[PDB]
Homo-oligomer: A and B are copies of this chain.
Amino acid sequence: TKQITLYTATFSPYAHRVRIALEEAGAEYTTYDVDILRNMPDWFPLVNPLKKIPAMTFGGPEVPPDQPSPESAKIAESLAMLEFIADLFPDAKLLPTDPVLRARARTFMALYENYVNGQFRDVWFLGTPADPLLQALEMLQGALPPDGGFAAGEWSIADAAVIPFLARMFPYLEAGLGLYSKEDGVKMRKAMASERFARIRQYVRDCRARPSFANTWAGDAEQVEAAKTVPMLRVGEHHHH
């Protein structure tokens, strides 16, 4: 019965995580776009003082999202939101019930956060060399069950945490968006198409085929256009060597 409002932005993989989870949960919820990188509304720090998307309000009186209530719980940090949605909707089985399988999900989310995400950021925002990112992606790929399935076997929030980033990689590379050079772009495109990365390609197809992805993705071309609005992606700019 308690309302959920998610403050979102199409470009944001962090917001995308939470939309996927809410879809998989069958939740009733509102989304409200915020132009966080270019024109943040003066009320936005009332929902998230960190001034980041996503933000979430929970409960309180039903109010317009641009008039947030002080009575709603304010929840920050996308991974905390994923665990919250799992806790709110236990019948949706957004995590396994077995402790070891649950730990596979948590480990996969930590491997992504601690080893992969920062490599994506370095390559895309600074144009650092692509090899350490490919190495990190090969490590993450090796944590998947080789013969098929999601991170913990059955789909879980671990897959919501990771697919937004992997799904953006392919179309962003095809558009040449990000500070890496053409040489490294070609290298990453060839690597991600090679047998070395067949398993992570299967993973991306499997996550993308679910309605939770279809219903929260604008389309590859539209997602690229939204990403070009991100100041830190510096459309038209590339660093070399």
- List residues of chain A with CB under 8 Å of any chain B CB: 50, 58-59, 73, 75-77, 79-81, 83-84, 87-88, 99-100, 102-103, 106-107, 109-111, 113-114, 139
Q: Which of B73, B81, B100, B111 contacts A77 (CB 8 A)?
A: B111
Question: In whole angstroms, how far apart are the Cα atoms of A109 and B80 in the complex?
Answer: 8
For this complex, 11 residue pairs linking A to B, each with C-beta atoms less than 8 Å apart, are A58-B100, A75-B107, A76-B107, A76-B110, A76-B111, A77-B106, A79-B110, A80-B106, A81-B103, A83-B103, A83-B106
Nearest-neighbor residue (CB-CB) of A75 within chain B: B103
Q: Which of B50, B81, B88, B102 contacts A83 (CB 8 A)?
A: B102
Question: In whole angstroms, how far apart are the Cα atoms of A88 and B103 in the complex?
Answer: 10
Question: In whole angstroms, how far apart are the Cα atoms of A113 and B79 in the complex?
Answer: 11
By a CB distance below 8 angstroms, the chain B residues around A103 are 73, 75, 80-81, 83-84, 87
Q: Which of B87, B102, B107, B113 contacts A102 (CB 8 A)?
A: B87
By a CB distance below 8 angstroms, the chain B residues around A50 are 139
Pairwise interchain contact A102-B76, C-beta atoms closer than 8 A: no
Question: In whole angstroms, how far apart are the Cα atoms of A13 and B2 in the complex?
Answer: 38
Nearest-neighbor residue (CB-CB) of A73 within chain B: B100
By a CB distance below 8 angstroms, the chain B residues around A102 are 83-84, 87
Q: Which of B77, B83, B111 contacts A114 (CB 8 A)?
A: B77
Nearest-neighbor residue (CB-CB) of A107 within chain B: B80
Which 6 A-B pairs give the minimum distances between C-beta atoms? A77-B110, A80-B106, A80-B107, A84-B103, A87-B99, A83-B106
By a CB distance below 8 angstroms, the chain B residues around A77 are 106-107, 110-111, 114
Question: In whole angstroms, how far apart are the Cα atoms of A77 and B73 in the complex?
Answer: 29
Nearest-neighbor residue (CB-CB) of A139 within chain B: B50
Q: Which of B59, B73, B84 contacts A106 (CB 8 A)?
A: B84
Extra A-B contacts (7), CB below 8 Å, given A80-B107, A81-B103, A113-B113: A73-B100, A77-B110, A79-B106, A79-B110, A80-B103, A83-B102, A84-B102
Interchain nearest-CB distance for A140 vs B (Å):
11
Nearest-neighbor residue (CB-CB) of A105 within chain B: B80
By a CB distance below 8 angstroms, the chain B residues around A109 are 80
